[PDB]
Write a protein that holds these residues in place. Structure first.
Motif, PDB file in Angstrom:
ATOM      1  N   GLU A 170      -7.806  21.256  55.922  1.00 39.11           N
ATOM      2  CA  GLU A 170      -7.331  22.031  54.760  1.00 39.11           C
ATOM      3  C   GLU A 170      -6.165  21.250  54.166  1.00 39.11           C
ATOM      4  OE1 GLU A 170      -5.654  23.878  52.724  1.00 39.11           O
ATOM      5  OE2 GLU A 170      -7.516  24.723  51.828  1.00 39.11           O
ATOM      6  N   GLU A 171      -6.309  20.782  52.936  1.00 39.91           N
ATOM      7  CA  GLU A 171      -5.311  19.927  52.328  1.00 39.91           C
ATOM      8  C   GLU A 171      -3.967  20.612  52.107  1.00 39.91           C
ATOM      9  OE1 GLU A 171      -8.481  20.937  51.340  1.00 39.91           O
ATOM     10  OE2 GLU A 171      -8.819  19.700  49.537  1.00 39.91           O
ATOM     11  N   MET A 172      -3.951  21.926  51.808  1.00 41.21           N
ATOM     12  CA  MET A 172      -2.663  22.615  51.694  1.00 41.21           C
ATOM     13  C   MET A 172      -1.944  22.646  53.030  1.00 41.21           C
ATOM     14  SD  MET A 172      -3.623  25.746  49.093  1.00 41.21           S
ATOM     15  CE  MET A 172      -4.893  26.464  50.099  1.00 41.21           C
ATOM     16  N   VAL A 223      -0.551  19.023  53.519  1.00 42.49           N
ATOM     17  CA  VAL A 223       0.504  18.562  52.646  1.00 42.49           C
ATOM     18  C   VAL A 223       1.771  19.388  52.724  1.00 42.49           C
ATOM     19  CG1 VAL A 223       1.023  18.259  50.200  1.00 42.49           C
ATOM     20  CG2 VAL A 223      -1.127  17.404  51.126  1.00 42.49           C
ATOM     21  N   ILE A 224       1.683  20.713  52.836  1.00 44.49           N
ATOM     22  CA  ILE A 224       2.897  21.523  52.868  1.00 44.49           C
ATOM     23  C   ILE A 224       3.747  21.131  54.075  1.00 44.49           C
ATOM     24  CG2 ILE A 224       3.807  23.861  53.105  1.00 44.49           C
ATOM     25  CD1 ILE A 224       1.375  24.766  51.362  1.00 44.49           C
ATOM     26  N   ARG A 262     -11.288  21.027  50.404  1.00 40.87           N
ATOM     27  CA  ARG A 262     -11.443  21.309  48.966  1.00 40.87           C
ATOM     28  C   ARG A 262     -11.425  20.022  48.168  1.00 40.87           C
ATOM     29  NH1 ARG A 262     -10.949  25.400  52.594  1.00 40.87           N
ATOM     30  NH2 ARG A 262     -11.850  27.332  51.702  1.00 40.87           N
ATOM     31  N   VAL A 278      -9.767  17.289  47.964  1.00 38.87           N
ATOM     32  CA  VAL A 278      -8.621  16.420  47.781  1.00 38.87           C
ATOM     33  C   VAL A 278      -8.742  15.263  48.790  1.00 38.87           C
ATOM     34  CG1 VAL A 278      -6.104  16.244  47.910  1.00 38.87           C
ATOM     35  CG2 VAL A 278      -7.195  18.244  46.846  1.00 38.87           C
ATOM     36  N   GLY A 327      -2.192  30.692  57.922  1.00 44.77           N
ATOM     37  CA  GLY A 327      -2.996  30.299  56.769  1.00 44.77           C
ATOM     38  C   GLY A 327      -2.185  29.667  55.686  1.00 44.77           C
ATOM     39  N   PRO A 328      -2.843  29.336  54.561  1.00 44.54           N
ATOM     40  CA  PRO A 328      -2.113  28.713  53.435  1.00 44.54           C
ATOM     41  C   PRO A 328      -0.848  29.453  53.070  1.00 44.54           C
ATOM     42  CG  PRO A 328      -4.461  28.518  53.119  1.00 44.54           C
ATOM     43  CD  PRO A 328      -4.263  29.417  54.308  1.00 44.54           C
ATOM     44  N   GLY A 329      -0.944  30.782  53.021  1.00 45.09           N
ATOM     45  CA  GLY A 329       0.175  31.603  52.616  1.00 45.09           C
ATOM     46  C   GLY A 329       1.283  31.710  53.648  1.00 45.09           C
ATOM     47  N   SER A 373       2.155  28.790  55.292  1.00 48.86           N
ATOM     48  CA  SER A 373       2.402  27.380  55.641  1.00 48.86           C
ATOM     49  C   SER A 373       3.833  26.977  55.361  1.00 48.86           C
ATOM     50  CB  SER A 373       1.401  26.457  54.933  1.00 48.86           C
ATOM     51  OG  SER A 373       1.532  26.547  53.512  1.00 48.86           O
TER      52      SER A 373
END
Lengths: 187, 187
Positions: free
Chosen positions: A14-16, A19-20, A47, A49, A156-158, A160
């Motif tokens: 997962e790229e987010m 990267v985060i 996704r 990226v 999850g993303p939220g 991170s």
């Protein structure tokens, strides 16, 4: 002396979730190596990226040890991490030297695969719970970030930013984490 | 027919501000093109994450128009966007056709440079306010996401999920945005 982080980047990560933590750790002055599981070549994330790693995992391993090993999520990325003998060795050695391991979303399921941290409290993405809990080797948490000693997990993303700042706090302390957090415009 | 987004990626762009909108828009079924300002080559972001664009901006422009043009932040990335005649042309054409333009953090300062959207309510990162407000051509907001018709702006890494979901809502509607949001584990 700055702290150092190894982020292991596999196809389908997962790229987010990659990267985060990399960015926030670099904002904290941590020396981060983005290591490609498969080699030096660019990595196609979940996704689509495409991220170019700093080094191959083989090469990065020779430059350790690291103060934290970070496992991004993404189901296919986590599967690739889980299938890798090189990742097994890195995580066992990190656990053996009492170093921090941090994993987010499906990322913690690679800890299960490699028999890392059994008996810890962990969280994962909600959809990864059943996989993580197969065998009852961990105790599940719904906290957005969970840290049971040297095993640090998140959902999850939220979550991170919270995950990344928890790594920063663990390595560099609460004050550095607070200073890095303010310019991010968190709620 | 799916909606399409152009994300313009320049050296020094903030990688979180690039990847979060790309990923969330792709989760929404938007067809996203990550276009490199300078060409097809990999782009070194502000915190040294290296992203490979899908296409050069020159090539992506020929495949438009797009339902949204997205400008990531990062001060040096925003400066590169602001100095580019190609970006000027794309943004003027998007404005002329009544298409959405979305910019986050220092990203909106490229709108100032290219004289886009004057008279709109906008937000930026707090540290970019004075630059954005030079001349009083916009009205400033401290909302985490601001949308004044076809100019959509936001403040920073910590507002980037809200920003991306606002783009999704604008293009695909509130229900799609809500469906994409739930698996993200937002607070």
């Amino acid at each position: 002396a700055s702290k150092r982080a190894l982020v292991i980047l596999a196809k389908g990560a997962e790229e987010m979730l990659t990267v985060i933590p990399v960015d926030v750790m670099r904002r904290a002055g941590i020396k981060v190596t983005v290591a490609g599981l498969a080699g030096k070549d660019p990595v196609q994330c979940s996704r689509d990226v495409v991220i170019c790693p700093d080094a191959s995992l083989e090469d990065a391993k020779k430059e350790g040890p690291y103060d934290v090993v970070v496992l991004p999520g993404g189901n296919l990325g986590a599967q690739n991490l889980s299938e890798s003998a090189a990742v097994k060795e890195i995580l066992k050695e990190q656990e053996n030297r009492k170093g921090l391991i941090a994993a987010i979303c499906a990322g913690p399921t690679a800890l299960l695969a490699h028999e890392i941290g059994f008996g810890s409290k962990v969280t994962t993405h909600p959809l990864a719970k059943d996989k993580m809990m197969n065998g009852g080797h961990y105790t599940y948490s719904e906290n957005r970030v969970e840290k049971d000693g040297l095993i640090l997990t998140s959902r999850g993303p939220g979550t991170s930013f919270e995950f990344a700042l928890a790594i920063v706090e663990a390595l560099n302390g609460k004050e550095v984490a607070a200073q890095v957090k303010a310019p991010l415009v968190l709620k």
